[PDB]
Design a binder for these strands. Structure first.
Ligand SMILES: [Zn+2]
Ligand SMILES: [Zn+2]
Ligand SMILES: [Zn+2]
Ligand SMILES: [Zn+2]
Lengths: 76, 78
DNA sequence: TGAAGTCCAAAGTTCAGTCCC
DNA sequence: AGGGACTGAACTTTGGACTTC
């Protein structure tokens, strides 16, 4: 099973979508800090294993596209 | 532990070797900008906390000899 | 046990001081 | 004078290892 966000190896369902440990942590931290970030390009950046850290905005957007929900992220 | 490159205090393992923040930073920049340093002397310069900035060629050479890996340096990001 | 959570080593970024073109 | 480059410390983000409900 591959990560629905970046294509890396998936470790199971996280926050509503199958994803790797990276996209898992990235999403949780983003939601808890209520970050939306911003893209400096056309908000259509390539989010794969190698470039996932190049644009937080696009990575986060794809997490939501993949099915992740803020609702699934807990406080603390 | 100490920096395997210059002897200064090590802040942990960096790019594969125990090193300080100075050598950590130096290696990263050297790799990302693919700088081709040269040595004015015999390429046997002593690299310590004191002289580390005297010869970039030898400090980089020491970095690789100490275990730092080019592959461990990631691409710059925002 | 599934899917939340936490921990933390090792990546990354910014920038003041300082000097060269 | 404006443009550019380097160093290393302060501080943040990443993601794999492990823990709780
Ligand atoms: Zn992923
Ligand atoms: Zn983008
Ligand atoms: Zn050092
Ligand atoms: Zn030298």
């Amino acid at each position: 099973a591959l990560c629905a966000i970046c294509g890396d190896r998936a470790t199971g369902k996280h926050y509503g979508a199958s994803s790797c440990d990276g996209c898992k942590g990235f999403f949780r931290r983003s939601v808890r800090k209520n970050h939306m970030y911003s893209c400096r390009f056309s908000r259509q950046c390539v989010v794969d294993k190698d470039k996932r850290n190049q644009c937080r905005y696009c990575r986060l957007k794809k997490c939501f596209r993949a099915g992740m929900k803020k609702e699934a992220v807990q406080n603390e």
